[PDB]
Amino acid sequence: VPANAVTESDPAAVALKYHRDAASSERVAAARPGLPPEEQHCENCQFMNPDSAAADWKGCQLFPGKLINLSGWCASWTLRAG
Amino acid sequence: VPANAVTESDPAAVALKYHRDAASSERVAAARPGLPPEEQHCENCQFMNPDSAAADWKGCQLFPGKLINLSGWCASWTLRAG
Numbered sequence: 001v002p003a004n005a006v007t008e009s010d011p012a013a014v015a016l017k018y019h020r021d022a023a024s025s026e027r028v029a030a031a032r033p034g035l036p037p038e039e040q041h042c043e044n045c046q047f048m049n050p051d052s053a054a055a056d057w058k059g060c061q062l063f064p065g066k067l068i069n070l071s072g073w074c075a076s077w078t079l080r081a082g
Numbered sequence: 083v084p085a086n087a088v089t090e091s092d093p094a095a096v097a098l099k100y101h102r103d104a105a106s107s108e109r110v111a112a113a114r115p116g117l118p119p120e121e122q123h124c125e126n127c128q129f130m131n132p133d134s135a136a137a138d139w140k141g142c143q144l145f146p147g148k149l150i151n152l153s154g155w156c157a158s159w160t161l162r163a164g
């Protein structure tokens with residue numbers, strides 16, 4: 001929707017395996033540590049920028065100037081510190 | 083040197099912990115799998131774009147339009163497939 005939203009065809013997105021819907025991602029296979037794969041989303045990711053965008057479209061450290069979907073996922077998923 | 087070279091102060095670089103010289107990085111601590119930390123550099127990283135730039139300054143999938151140093155390192159280090 002937002003013109004600056006990261007596309008799944010964007011080369012950097014493809015490299016990272018980003019998907020607007022975490023259900024379409026290889027997260028169960030990646031088996032990244034921190035939380036069960038099913039629980040892994042941009043919403044609880046360390047690199048997500050909540051002070052960026054509006055609504056479901058917040059920002060991400062790996063995609064400067066662009067917006068990821070809070071329900072998405074990518075291979076760099078890291079549980080938000082706290 | 084190249085105007086498009088990724089700076090260590092660049093926000094995305096800081097997030098990823100990128101360092102022009104892999105010796106200045108937290109690679110021994112990160113203990114990423116694939117090759118001994120000492121052996122980890124952009125030169126043997128999966129996301130490095132060799133067909134981009136010239137000399138020591140080649141490209142990287144995580145830094146679109148920018149150039150990383152082949153001797154560098156960042157937390158996303160992944161041994162080049164092959």
Ligand code: SF4
Binds near residue numbers: 048062073075076
């Ligand atoms: S690093 Fe995190 S916030 Fe960014 S696209 Fe990936 S899963 Fe989402």
Ligand code: SF4
Binds near residue numbers: 150
């Ligand atoms: S992902 Fe690889 S090529 Fe890119 S800055 Fe990092 S260590 Fe270097």
